[PDB]
Amino acid sequence: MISGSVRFLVNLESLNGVESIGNLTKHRTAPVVLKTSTGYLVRYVPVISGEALAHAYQASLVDIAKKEGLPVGSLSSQYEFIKFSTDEALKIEGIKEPKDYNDARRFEVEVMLKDVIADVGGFMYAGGAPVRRTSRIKLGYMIPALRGDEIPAQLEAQFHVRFSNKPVAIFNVEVSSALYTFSFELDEDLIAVPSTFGEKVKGEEELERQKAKRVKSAIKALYSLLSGNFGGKRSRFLPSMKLMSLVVTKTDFPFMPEPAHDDDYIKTTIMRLGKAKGVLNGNLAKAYVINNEGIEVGEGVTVLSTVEDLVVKLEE
Amino acid sequence: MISGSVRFLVNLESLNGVESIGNLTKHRTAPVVLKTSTGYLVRYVPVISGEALAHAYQASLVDIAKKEGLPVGSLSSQYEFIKFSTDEALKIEGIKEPKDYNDARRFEVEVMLKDVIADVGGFMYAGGAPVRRTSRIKLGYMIPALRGDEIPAQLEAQFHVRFSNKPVAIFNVEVSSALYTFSFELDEDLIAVPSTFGEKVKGEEELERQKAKRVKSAIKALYSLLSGNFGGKRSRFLPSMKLMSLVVTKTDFPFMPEPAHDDDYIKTTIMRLGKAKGVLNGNLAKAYVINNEGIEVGEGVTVLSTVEDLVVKLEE
Amino acid sequence: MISGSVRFLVNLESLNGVESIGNLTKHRTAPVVLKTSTGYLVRYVPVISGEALAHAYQASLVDIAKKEGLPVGSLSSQYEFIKFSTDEALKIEGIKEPKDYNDARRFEVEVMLKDVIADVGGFMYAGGAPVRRTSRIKLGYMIPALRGDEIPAQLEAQFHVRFSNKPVAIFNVEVSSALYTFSFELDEDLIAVPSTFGEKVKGEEELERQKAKRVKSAIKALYSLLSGNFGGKRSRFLPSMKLMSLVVTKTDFPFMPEPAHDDDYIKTTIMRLGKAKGVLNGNLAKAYVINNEGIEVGEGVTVLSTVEDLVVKLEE
Amino acid sequence: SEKENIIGRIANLLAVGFLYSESPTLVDRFANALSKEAVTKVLYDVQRIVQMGIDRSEIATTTIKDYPAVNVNSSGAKYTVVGYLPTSQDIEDFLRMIEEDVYYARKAGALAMSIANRIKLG
Amino acid sequence: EKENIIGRIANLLAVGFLYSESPTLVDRFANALSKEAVTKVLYDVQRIVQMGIDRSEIATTTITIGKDYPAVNVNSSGAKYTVVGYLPTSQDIEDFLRMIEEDVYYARKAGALAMSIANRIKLGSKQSKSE
Amino acid sequence: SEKENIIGRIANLLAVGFLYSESPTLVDRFANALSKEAVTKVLYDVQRIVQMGIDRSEIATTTITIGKDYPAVNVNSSGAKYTVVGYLPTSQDIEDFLRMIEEDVYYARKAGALAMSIANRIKLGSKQSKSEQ
Amino acid sequence: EKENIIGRIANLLAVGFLYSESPTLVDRFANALSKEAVTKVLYDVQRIVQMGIDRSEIATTTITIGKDYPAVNVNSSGAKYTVVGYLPTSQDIEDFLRMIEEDVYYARKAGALAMSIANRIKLGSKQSKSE
DNA sequence: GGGGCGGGTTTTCCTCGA
RNA sequence: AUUGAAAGUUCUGUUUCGAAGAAAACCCGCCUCAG
Secondary structure (H helix, E strand, O other): OEEEEEEEEEEEEOOOEOOOEOOEEOEOEEEEEEEEOOEEEEEEEEOEOHHHHHHHHHHHHHHHHHHHOOOOOHHHHOOOOOOOOOHHHHHHHOOOOOOOOOOHHHHHHHHHOOOHHHHHHOEEEOOOOOEEEOOOEEOOOEEEOOOOOOOOEEEEEEEEEOOOOOOOOEEEEEEEEEEEEEEEEEOHHHOOOOOOOOOOOOOHHHHHHHHHHHHHHHHHOHHHHHHOOOOOOOOOOOOEEEEEEEEEEEEOOOOOOOOOOOOOOOHHHHHHHHHHHHHHOOOOEEEEEEEOOOOOOOOOOEEOOOHHHHHHHHHO | OEEEEEEEEEEEEOOOEOOOEOOEEOEOEEEEEEEEOOEEEEEEEEOEOHHHHHHHHHHHHHHHHHHHOOOOOHHHHOOOOOOOOOHHHHHHHOOOOOOOOOOHHHHHHHHHOOOHHHHHHOEEEOOOOOEEEOOOEEOEOEEEOOOOOOOOEEEEEEEEEOOOOOOOOEEEEEEEEEEEEEEEEEOHHHOOOOOOOOOOOOOHHHHHHHHHHHHHHHHHOHHHHHHOOOOOOOOOOOOEEEEEEEEEEEEOOOOOOOOOOOOOOOHHHHHHHHHHHHHHOOOOEEEEEEEOOOOOOOOOOEEOOOHHHHHHHHHO | OEEEEEEEEEEEEOOOEOOOEOOEEOEOEEEEEEEOOOOEEEEEEEOEOHHHHHHHHHHHHHHHHHHHOOOOOHHHHOOOOOOOOOHHHHHHHOOOOOOOOOOHHHHHHHHHHHOHHHHHOOOEEOOOOOEEOOOOEEEOOEEEOOOOOOOOOEEEEEEEEOOOOOOOOEEEEEEEEEOEEEEEEEOOOOOOOOOOOOOOOOOHHHHHHHHHHHHHHHHHOHHHHHHOOOOOOOOOOEOEEEEEEEEEEEEOOOOOOOOOOOOOOHHHHHHHHHHHHHHHOOOOEEEEEEEOOOOOOOOOOEEOOOHHHHHHHHHO | OHHHHHHHHHHHHHHHHHHHHOOOHHHHHHHOOOOHHHHHHHHHHHHHHHHHHHHOOOEEEEEOOOOEEEEEEEOOEEEEEEOOOOOHHHHHHHHHHHHHOOHHHHHHHHHHHHHHHHHHHO | OHHHHHHHHHHHHHHHHHHHOOOHHHHHHHOOOOHHHHHHHHHHHHHHHHHHHHOOOEEEEEEEOOOEEEEEEEEEOOEEEEEEOOOOOHHHHHHHHHHHHHOOHHHHHHHHHHHHHHHHHHHHHHHHHHO | OHHHHHHHHHHHHHHHHHHHHOOOHHHHHHHOOOOHHHHHHHHHHHHHHHHHHHHOOOEEEEEEEOOOEEEEEEEEEOOEEEEEEOOOOOHHHHHHHHHHHHHOOHHHHHHHHHHHHHHHHHHHHHHHHHHHO | OHHHHHHHHHHHHHHHHHHHOOOHHHHHHHOOOOHHHHHHHHHHHHHHHHHHHHOOOEEEEEEEOOOEEEEEEEEEOOEEEEEEOOOOOHHHHHHHHHHHHHOOHHHHHHHHHHHHHHHHHHHHHHHHHHO
16 A cells, blocks of 8 residues: 655645635635644634545546556546446447346446546446445545644635726635645555456456556556646646655555644654554555655655655655 | 543544435434533534444454454455344355254354354344344444533535536535544453353364454454544545544453543543452453543553554553 | 432433334333423423343342352343243242242242342242242432423434345434433342241341341442443443432431432432431431532532442442 | 314425425424424425425426316326415414424324325326 | 514515525524524525615515505516515614514514415416416 | 613614615625624724715714604715714724624624614615605 | 733824824734834834924823823814823833734734724814814 | 725536435 | 332444536726925
8 A cells, every 4th residue: 555645835826616606706615623722623724625636636647548558438538537427428438237236247347448547546337236446546635734723824815807998897716825734545456456246257367467557557647646736727826836745655554644734743653654564464664755844754764855756666 | 341432533524424415415413412501502413323433343353354364254255244134144154044942052153153253243143043142342423522611523515516528517515523532342251252051062162262363353453443444435535533542441340431521531530440440359450541632641550652552562 | 228319411322222113213202291481391201211220230230249159040140030930930940839828938038048139139929829029129210300491302313224235224223312310229228138927947047147248249239320331232322421410328217319300409308318317216327429510519418529439338 | 173274285295295206204204203303304305305396397386176286297207286285374383283292293294195195006 | 563563574584585586594584492593584684685676676666456555576587576565674673683582483473474475476476377 | 781782883883884885895794704803894994984974074973853852873975865863883882892792703793784774774765765756 | 901002002093193194104003914014103103292292282181081081182283182091101012012923913903993092083073163 | 185987707517326 | 018029122234336616807097295
C-alpha cells in the first residue's frame, strides 16, 4: 500500500462551487469541531470536495493510458466518467448484460479488459445481477489544519461588472485563502485482479500480462494530484499553490499516517510505522519525507527535494 | 476480562447510512437525554451503529486467522457473516443438523472446529433443537460525549453534481463532525470453550490445543477497531481520525469502566477498580492509560504512547 | 432490613423486548396520564420488567456462591431457574417428595440444604402437600421519573440490513433513552431461617453455621444489580448507564424510602425514618446517600462516593 | 362525526402516496405510530411525495352523480382514488385527534391500505 | 380585534403559500410550540412577499364580489390568484406576537385559516382550467 | 421591558434607513447576522445613511397626533413621504443593544423582523393612497 | 476595564471629530487593518485636541445631568458641544494599543462608539437651532 | 464645501436497483 | 406473607457499491486646497 499526507498553502482560491443565491456564487463550507484551551468549539470553514480530486486523477490516468497504448473505454475517452452504470452506456460500448450470478465474473472481466478507469476507480452495475467493484484509490475532503486556537483560513466576496455601451451586468464571486491538508491511500497489490469470487474465465492471461503497465500508470497518475492540477474556475481565478510538507509510506500491511493537523506529525507516524511493522509481522516498510518549513523530522529518514523524485522512486 | 473506553475526534464524516429520501442520503440519528444547569433536555444527535464495528472486527479476525493457518469457514471465507443460521449454510459447509437435544453439543463442536468466527462472535441455529452461543466480544453505539450544556457535534448536507455532455445528475450527501466515545468488552477466558452443557465429546483436545492461538488472534483483532478501520463510504469520504484518550482494564472479575462523557473518568475508574478488587476478592487487576489531551490521570498508573504497545502488552 | 432507592440514566438502550410483529422487535411500554393546563394527556413510556432483574440477581448469586463452595443445585448450576417445582425437577436432584403436611417442614429443610437459590430466591412445589417460600429480595418495575410537566423518555425504530451476494435481509429494532428510577428491599435477617411452624428437624445446625456465609453472599449479589449487569441484547446494543442518586437505609424494623419520582425525595425519607423510629421503638437506623445531580440532601447522613463503599458498609 | 370524514381524507392521502410511491413504508409507519412525532413525520413525507406527483402532473384532482377523485399515474399504471384529499384544517384537526389518541393513525392506516389494495386488485 | 389580527396573519400566510407554491412555512407555523418558530415564519413569509412585491407579482387591489373589497393579487408560475382581505400591519404582527407569548394556539388558528384560503383558491383555479 | 423598548428603537432606525435608501440590503444583513461584527457594521451603515438624510433635511424628527402627540420621524425619498412613529435609538440604546447581541444574536433577528413590518405597513399605505388619487 | 478604555478612546475620537468637523480620522480608525493605522490616528486626533487645548476651545469641565459628571467642552465654528466622560490617559492609550496588537476589532468598536457620540450631539445642536 | 449615473444574473439536471 | 407462592421473549445480522456547479465578464469615465 501507498499512504500519503500532504500540506498545501493556497491564496485567492475558488475551485469548488455550490448552489448560488441571487448574483452571488458561493464557496463550499462545512462545520468542524476544534479544541481550544477553553474546551471544544464548532466553526464553519471553507472546504473542497474529494470528487474533484478523483475526477482530476481519472482524467490524468486517461491521458497516460491513451499515450501508453493501454485500452480506454469509448465513453471514458471523452471526459465523462459515467462508467458502466446505466444500460445506455452498455449499449454504446457493446457489452452484454449479465444473465445470472454465475456469469457476473465474466461481465466483470469484459468491463476490465476495455477500460483501465473501471479497473482502477471501480464501478457499479445495478440490475438483476448487480456487480460491484470498490475503487483502488481513496481520497477525502480537503480541510485546513486545525492547529492552535485560530483557524488559518478566510473567506470573502468580490465585486465584478460587465461592460456595455447600452445599459438596460453585476455579479459577486466568493474567494478564500487557507492552508489546506489532505491524505490519500492507494493499494497497488489489487490492481488488475478480479474481485468477484468464481471460477477461472478466459481473458485473465491478458490482465496478468498488462498488470505491470496498469500499476505503473496508476502510480504515475498521482503526479497531477501532488502537483496541483485540480479544481475549476482556473481560467480567471488561477490559484497560487506551494507545497510545504509531504509524507509517503509504502507498506505490505494496512497503515494510516497521522493527519497533517499538528506541527509534529512526521516523527509520530515514523515511530508508529516502526512499531506497527514490529507488531503485525510485516516484511516491508519504507518512508519518504519532503520538508520545506523546517519542522522536526527525526533520524534515519530519506529526504527528497521535489515530487518527481518521489514518483520515480515509487515506480522503481 | 478486558474492558476499554476510547475517545475519538472525527471531522467531515459519513460512515453509517440509513434510508434515503429523494436525492438525499441521510446519516443515522438518535435521541439523547442530557443534563444542563436548567434540568434535563432531549436532543437529536448523529450516531454510528455497533454492527459496523462488529463487522470490521470479524473481517480483521478472518484475515488474521487465514494468515496464521487457523481454520476458516467456507462462507465466512468470503466477507458474508451469515454463519450457520439457515439450512442453506449448513448444506454448503456440509454439517449435519442436530437430531435431538443430547446431540446439540456435538453439533456445536462441529461448528467450533471449522470457523473461528463462530467461536468468537457466537452463532444461532433455529429448528427442532435450537443451538445458541453468545458473542465473546461486546460493543455498543458510538455516541459523542454529553459534556457540559452544548453537544460538540454538527450535521449538514452537501451538494454534488455528475457531469454529462448531453443533459436530459444531482444528489446530496449528509456530513457530520463530532467527538465520539465508545466502550468495549472482551472476555478471553471463555474462548475455545464449549458453552452447551453435556458430556464429553471427541474433538475437545484439538480445541484445547488451539486455545492459545485463538486467544492470541482474538486479542490481535482489536487493533483494527482501536486504529479506525471501520465504516463505509471510505472511497470518497475518508475521515480524519485522531485518538485522544484510552483506558484499558484487565481483571479476573466483572468490571465496567466509566463512560467517556466526563473530563475526569480515569481517576474514578482506577479508584473503582481498586475498591472492586478489594471487595470482590480478586487476584488480578491491571490498568493502562493513553492520554493525549493533558487531563488528570492519577498516580501509580502505567502510561503508554501508541496502541501497538498496548496490543503487545495485552498479548504478553 | 435493607431498603434502597436508586436513580439511573441510560442512553441508546434495548434490554427488554416484547412480542415480535412482522419483522419488528418492539420495546415494553406502559401508559401514563400527565396533567396539563388544558387537561390530561395519555402517553406511552418505555419500562423494564422486574423479572429480568431477578434473573440477573440470581445468576450473580450463583456465580458468587459457586466460588465459595456453597451448595448449588444441579439444574441451577446451569442457568435454568426452574427450581424444585414438579416431580421431574426433583428426580434429577434426588429428593424424595414430602409425605404429608406434618413432614412438610422437613422437606423444606432438605431443599434448603441442597440449593442456596431455593432459599434466598424462594421456591414453590405444586402437589398434594404444597410448600412455599417467599423471596428474600423484592424488586420493582423500572419506570422513568414522572417529574415536572415533561417525560424525559423517547423511543425510535432503527432499520438494519444484512449483506448477501445473491439477493433473493431486513429487520427493525426499537431503541430508547430515558432516566430510570427503581427501588428494592432485602431482609438479611431472615436468611437461613425456615418458614414453617413445627418442631425442629435434624440438620438445622448446618443452616445455623452457614447463615453468615449465605448472608454475605446475598449482600454481595446486590453489586451486580447496582452496577448494571441486567437485561439482554448486550452483544450489539450494549447500553451506557450512569448513577445519579442513591439512598440506602438499614434498620431493625420494616421501612421503605419514598419513590424517586420527585426532585426532593431524600429529605422526606430521612424525616419519615426519624418519625417511624419514634413510633416503632427501633434501635438501629442508618442512611447512606450518594449524590451526583446536586439535589438537596439534609443533615445526619454519611456521604459516600461509589457503590463498593456502600457494599462494604452494609457487610460490616 | 366529521372525525370520520377527516380520518377518511387522511386515508385517501396515504393511499394516493402509497399508489404513487409503490411503497407501503409510510403507511406501515403511520399504522404503527406510538407518538405524535411519528404521525406528523409521515403526514409531511406523504404530502412531499404527493407534491412531487402534482409538480410532474402525475397526481391530479378530477371528478368521476360526479364524485371527487384523485388520478395517480405511477410506472405506467393509472389509479383513481375516490374522495377528497385533506385540507390544512383537516391535518391540524387530525393532529389534535392524535394528541388525544394515536388510535386514529391506526384507523386511517387500515383504511388507506384497504383503498390501495382494492385499487391494485382491480 | 384578535380575530381580525388572526385573519390578517392568515391572509399573509396564504399569499406567501400561493406565491412560493410551498406549504413548508404554513406547516412550521401550525406546528409551532415556541415564539421562536412563529417569529421565524413571520419573517420568512414576509421576505417571500417582499420579493413578490419587488417583482410586481404581488400587488394590493380592490375587487367587486356589489361593494369593493380589499384584495391581494398573486401571480405565480403563470397562475393568477386573488386573496380577499388586508395584509397585517406592523402593529398586527406585534400584537399577534404578544398573543403567541400568552398562547401558541393562535398560530395553529392562523395556520388552519391560511390553509383553508389557499385550498379554496387552488380548487377554483384548477376547476376553471379543466372547463 | 427596557430590552423591548431598545429593540423597538433599533427597529425604527432600520425602518427609517430602509425607507430612505429604498434598499432592504442592510435589514437583510441585520436579520441574518451570526456575529457581533455583522450587527455592528449594519448599525454604522444605517446611521450613516440616516446622517445623510438629516444633512439633506430629508430625515427630520417631528410629533404627530394619531389625540396625544406621538414622536415620529419624517422621511422624504424619491418624492415619496413616509412617517415612522417612535423614537430613534440613543447612543446608550446602541451600546446596550450591542451588549444584548454579545449575549444572544437573536435580538438582531427580532429587531429586523420589526423593522421589515414597519416598512411594509408604510409602503402598503403609501401605494394605496396613490391608487385612490 | 477594557470597555472603560474603549469608551475613553471613543470620547477622544468624538472630541477630535466635533472640533475638526471632519470624520476622516474616525473613518481611518474604524477601517484600520493594522496597528500602524490605529496608532497614526491616535497621534493625529490628540494633535488636533492639543491645538484646541492651546486655543482654550477644548476644556475639561463638570456638568450636572443631580450629580456632577466629567465632561469636555468643545467650541468649533461658533458651535458649542459637550462630550460627557473622560479623555484617555497615557496608560489607556498604551493598554488600548496592546488590545489592538491582539485584535484590531477594538478600533472598530471605539470608532462605532465615537460616531454615535458625535451624531447624537450634532442632532441635538441642530434641533436647538431650529427651535 | 459632506458628489452624481447605468447595472442586484441568465440553462441544465431534482435518483437508478435488490 | 394477600387467587398470594414458583419464571429473562433469549440467541445470530454493514443500506454497500459510483458521480468536477462547469463554462463567459474591467468599477470606469471628470476634479490643483489655492492664493
